[PDB]
């Protein structure tokens, strides 16, 4: 899916800073409740991350639940150019 660079940066930043993220299955929602990006782009970016094992996806009662993995943490650290010391708030 075509995603603006700023939107992808914001999504990745939020995911790494928090380590978890949810999303209601609403493709046409204007903005994600926690992220300024539209809901569809957040859902599809998380699906892309899950497809290559960067995140774990759980679905229940029309909602998504994404949890970052070690490979996902490494990818986000490399891509965001953050120092190795900084880690997701969950740890």
């Amino acid at each position: 899916m075509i995603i603006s660079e700023k939107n992808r940066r914001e999504i990745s930043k939020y995911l790494f800073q928090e380590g978890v993220c949810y999303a209601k299955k609403d493709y046409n929602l204007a903005k994600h409740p926690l992220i300024d990006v539209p809901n569809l782009q957040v859902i599809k970016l998380m699906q892309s991350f899950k497809s290559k094992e960067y995140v774990r996806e759980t679905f229940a009662w029309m909602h998504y639940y994404w949890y970052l993995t070690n490979d996902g943490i490494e990818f986000l650290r490399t891509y965001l150019n953050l120092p190795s010391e900084i880690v997701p708030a969950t740890l």
Binding site: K25, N28, W61, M62
Partner: protein, 55 residues
């Protein structure tokens, strides 16, 4: 589709503006007390919700 066309039809009321919060189906929604669950899902989750059968 085009932004002004894709999903542009108003959905402020009617069966198409509401769905089951458990399964997303738009049919047989129980709106009483704000449950917003379809009758099947509500009958499945009634005990957890706190609804008891006395008669």
């Amino acid at each position: 589709g085009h932004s002004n066309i894709w999903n542009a039809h108003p959905k402020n009321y009617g069966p198409g503006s509401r769905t089951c919060r458990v399964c997303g189906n738009p049919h047989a929604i129980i709106r009483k007390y704000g449950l917003m669950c379809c009758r099947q899902c509500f009958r499945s989750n009634a005990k957890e919700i706190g609804f008891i059968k006395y008669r």
